[PDB]
Amino acid sequence: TCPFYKKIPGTGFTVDAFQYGVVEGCTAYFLTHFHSDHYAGLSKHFTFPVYCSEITGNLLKNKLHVQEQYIHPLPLDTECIVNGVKVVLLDANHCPGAVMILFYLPNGTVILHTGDFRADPSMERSLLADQKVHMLYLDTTYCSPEYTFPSQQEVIRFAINTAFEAVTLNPHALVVCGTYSIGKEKVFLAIADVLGSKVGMSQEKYKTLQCLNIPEINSLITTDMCSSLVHLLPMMQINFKGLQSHLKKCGGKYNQILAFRPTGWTHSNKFTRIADVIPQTKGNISIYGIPYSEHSSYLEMKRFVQWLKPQKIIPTVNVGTWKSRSTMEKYFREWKLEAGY
Ligand code: NI
């Protein structure tokens, strides 16, 4: 049955709640972003209103075949009225088309649902700064102090310099990047840009990327693998077996693979600096795991919440164990006592 943390009190609304069948008394279904744990249950047979960003609405129509008449795309940073309730969509700094939702309840409560997000100081200068928020439904994916990672910029710098060095030393090396959902496009696009190549990929992934309003995208991507030296493959294929196989398929155009696996967190982060990351190598195949995150680190999350000073926090991630739930609640209390709210 729909969990309470997917329900907006004082409304008929749910958030990212498409796998429960008909939610009793739900009059509008919001979808924060096009990731499968969040959209699970949507299809062409869905007949209730879905509210989302334009980008998410492009993916609903073209990838899942949801009928146009049930898709209600909203512009960002704009006050809109949904079943008589004022809402605002904000950028979540997650994947393309990912939003946070501000709800202005008839009774005067203000609720922010972060969806999935990577907190950033730039958020402290959106429409959020203009009023107080009573309840925060928070993406707590990495809500423990061991979760530190570098800025997205430092990670991309590492990958561009790595790839450029390797292909300059060996003009017959192939670069491969893994993916399993939208997000992290900067990894492969930045690498192709410094090499003067387009990124080659399957037809289904090219279609997905064409839904995202990325500027000049027809200049960066292609379904012709032969004319490309940066290839995008399913994340599952980013291993020595999968890559040896792929290399065979290129028919002696290439003799070396350099592959990147943008992961979430990995425990080398507590110890290792980005400067200090090394690949795993077998034969003429090297694999780099790089900590390119689109969720908040512990410290980024803490800053955001201490800035916003909500009255009540409802976690949306890691809620399934008592030890997790209890630990998070302890961090929220420290944050509030340290900051004085
Ligand atoms: Ni997500």
Curated annotation (Swiss-Prot):
Binds constitutively to TP53BP1. Binds CDC27, which is itself a component of the anaphase promoting complex (APC). Binds PIAS1. May be required for DNA interstrand cross-link repair. Also required for checkpoint mediated cell cycle arrest in early prophase in response to mitotic spindle poisons. Possesses beta-lactamase activity, catalyzing the hydrolysis of penicillin G and nitrocefin. Exhibits no activity towards other beta-lactam antibiotic classes including cephalosporins (cefotaxime) and carbapenems (imipenem). The lineage of its organism: Eukaryota, Metazoa, Chordata, Craniata, Vertebrata. The chain holds residues 700 to 1040 of 1040 of the full protein. Belongs to the DNA repair metallo-beta-lactamase (DRMBL) family. Expressed in brain, heart, kidney, liver, pancreas, placenta and skeletal muscle. It is found in: Nucleus. This is DNA cross-link repair 1A protein. Induction: During mitosis. The mRNA encoding this protein contains an internal ribosome entry site (IRES) in its 5'-UTR. This 5'-UTR generally suppresses translation while specifically promoting expression during mitosis, when cap-dependent translation may be impaired.
